[PDB]
């Protein structure tokens, strides 16, 4: 037996979408459970049949965005096209440009929660480690086929490149200064990846 | 020379703070700990600093300026790969010799507008410097004209900010600290001279 809950799942989804909307204008501290309940069309007691706190709502939101990026990247890893090397790295990076770039408010809220929440910190750290291991393995496969030279240890080169994308894409999304303009940040990272993976 | 301009108590306050941030964040440091390290009563502290946050901002002002003037010294008295290595190694060595203040300064960026503006100001200045050197290396024909120089400069300087911090904080993921400078030099040099 499997317990399908179309109605409970749909309302959970409306709470999550309500939170994501509110985060575009206000930090999580300025959002109340009543704002969440009212956005989701339920009473405030009813909210607690779906989440225990507004922090659990944000943790679920970050779960959703991080796993959407992870799954999109894994989808690329299992369906390799007949394409050039620059396009390979560009579509991989664009997974993160497009996923987090379409969820800017949740991304900003997650970064801010990284210092106060161990779950968020360990969530982000877990997925960075996996994406770095994946990058390292693609770098090594490019070395094995003779397409990239054996320079730095793959995992170290992978770590610095993925940390660059983290800092740089966030600076673009959050409109920080300094930042690369959002319309130019993909080309910028792709160039640095491709030159440093294939050059000596 | 590099001596803090105040008397011995101002030095003692700053060094006690820097020492204690080695194992505790600033919230776990009291004004009393700072005053005790300088040998003064608690109210006497406020003849030197208005708050313990002011002490951390002054310590980070010293680190950031020590970095900027070691780099401006490089600019006055000059192979391409080693030029970038010595410039990156200014930050590896400066912030690597103040890991406690660097890590406390990073945490204070979220809560202090002075700290965030301080960091953003010198990052802009350091990125402009990188961008000018890239432009001079293109005008003499040594580097290809690929990305806009200021945009390539920004990502590499943000790379270093986030990668050196991860090494110095022992984060996972991070590059081991004995290997971080070669890693960043290689990426800087391939991306600045590659087509
Ligand atoms: O991590 C990122 C993005 C994510 C979005 N960003 C964030 N900034 N703060 C955030 N935060 C804090 C708490 C919650 C979220 S997320 C900026 C960058 N990466 C990994 C590196 C790279 C991955 C890759 C691997 C293999 C092949 C191609 C590409 C592509 C980009």
Author numbering:
A (entry chain B): 15 to 214
B (entry chain A): 17 to 94, 98 to 214
Provide the publication's sentences verbatim.
The mycobacterial HTH-transcriptional regulator (EthR) has been reported to be a facilitator for the resistance of the second-line tuberculosis drug, ethionamide. Studies of the resistance mechanism of ethionamide revealed that an increase in the expression of HTH-Transcriptional regulator, EthR, reduces transcription and the level of active EthA protein, and results in resistance by M. tuberculosis. The discovery of this transcriptional regulator led to the notion of controlling EthA expression levels by targeting EthR and thus boosting the bactericidal effect of ethionamide. EthR binding site is characterized by a long hydrophobic tunnel surrounded mostly by hydrophobic residues, many of which are aromatic, plus four polar amino acids and a basic residue.
We then managed to obtain X-ray crystal structures for compounds 1, 2, 3, 5, 6, 7, 10, and 12 bound to EthR. Another common feature shared between several of the compounds (1, 2, 3, 7, and 10) is the presence of a ketone that forms a hydrogen bond with N176 in all but compound 3.
